């Protein structure tokens, strides 16, 4: 079986390249971050603009929701992360500690911690309540492209332009594993699978790979798209058919069958690199965002 995603809405608003889009865990909203220093909230089902959240001094590279859909955390070129209360729009805390651009961020499952990756080549773990840095991990030898907590939050996976994917013990900060294949291209994105058994990793050699974390080996590879310059997000679509979703440097959204690795659909419409995609938690809905020459977000819907 194959999906039939069709364009339903195009969201205009950001004045510069959009950097990331994420659906709230409760499925009510879509948050977007942009090089325009802003975060915008949109209705997940109707694509209707809700509000703008401002505060950062420079462009934003990533934004993420807390487990209860009440908070957001953003990573910016101003070298800070900001925790926001979505309902009030207030900046609850500004996390200062990184010495260079903050590139990626995420809350842990209980949302009491935030993990961040920066151009300073480190990974930091922060306490949400106090906004204080708990640990600084000398994780890589190049910018950290992504950071993500596993299902129970005991592990953190990080990726970097240095070509490595490393898994860290949240409590001790010890490097528990370094994953790399036969080549050393920059690793542009990583994240644990929904069940926490795998790690989906993107490398700047036009490849996505599904790794078995425990065994430390590559199980599947997804190819066919273009990705050699930007850190494009990738997702696990689990509402209908089990797919792998990702933007591409040819302005398209690619969708692969996770098990067979075959391309099942390509979404056309954006006018620039699709830097970020996200899959709704309960409906077969995909949100995609593009760079500078496009500046829009698109919502696609499928029956399966």
């Amino acid at each position: 079986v194959k999906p039939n995603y069709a364009l339903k809405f195009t969201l205009a608003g950001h004045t510069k390249a959009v950097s990331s889009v994420k659906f709230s865990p409760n499925g009510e909203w879509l948050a977007s971050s942009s090089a325009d220093k802003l975060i915008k909230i949109w209705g997940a089902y109707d694509g209707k603009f809700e509000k703008t959240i401002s505060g950062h001094k420079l462009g934003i590279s990533d934004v993420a929701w807390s487990s209860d859909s009440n908070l957001l955390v953003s990573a910016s070129d101003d070298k800070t992360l900001k925790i926001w209360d979505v309902s009030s729009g207030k900046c609850l805390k500004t996390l200062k500690g990184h010495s260079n651009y903050v590139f990626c961020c995420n809350f842990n499952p209980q949302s009491n911690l935030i993990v961040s990756g920066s151009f300073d080549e480190s990974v930091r773990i922060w306490d949400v309540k106090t906004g204080k840095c708990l640990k600084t991990l000398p994780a890589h030898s190049d910018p950290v492209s992504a950071v993500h907590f596993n299902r129970d939050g005991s592990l953190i996976v990080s990726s970097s332009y240095d070509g490595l994917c490393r898994i860290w013990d949240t409590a001790s900060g010890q490097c528990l594993k370094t994953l790399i294949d036969d080549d050393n291209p920059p690793v542009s994105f990583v994240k644990f699978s929904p069940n926490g058994k795998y790690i989906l990793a993107a490398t700047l050699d036009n490849t996505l790979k599904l790794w078995d974390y425990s065994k430390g080996k590559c199980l599947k590879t997804y190819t066919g798209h273009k990705n050699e310059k930007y850190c494009i997000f990738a997702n696990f679509s689990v509402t209908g058919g089990k797919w792998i979703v990702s933007g591409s440097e040819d302005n398209l959204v690619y969708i692969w069958n996770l098990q067979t690795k075959e391309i099942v659909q390509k979404l056309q419409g954006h006018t620039d690199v699709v830097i970020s995609t996200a899959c709704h938690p309960t409906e077969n809905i995909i949100a995609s965002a593009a760079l500078e020459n496009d500046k829009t977000i698109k919502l696609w819907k499928s029956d399966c």
Binding site: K16, A17, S19, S20, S34, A35, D36, K37, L58, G59, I60, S61, D62, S76, D77, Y101, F103, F119, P143, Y161, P186, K229, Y230, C231, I275, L291, E292
Partner: peptide
Amino acid sequence: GSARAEVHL
């Protein structure tokens, strides 16, 4: 405008 929207060598 932001690191992610730029190319890194």
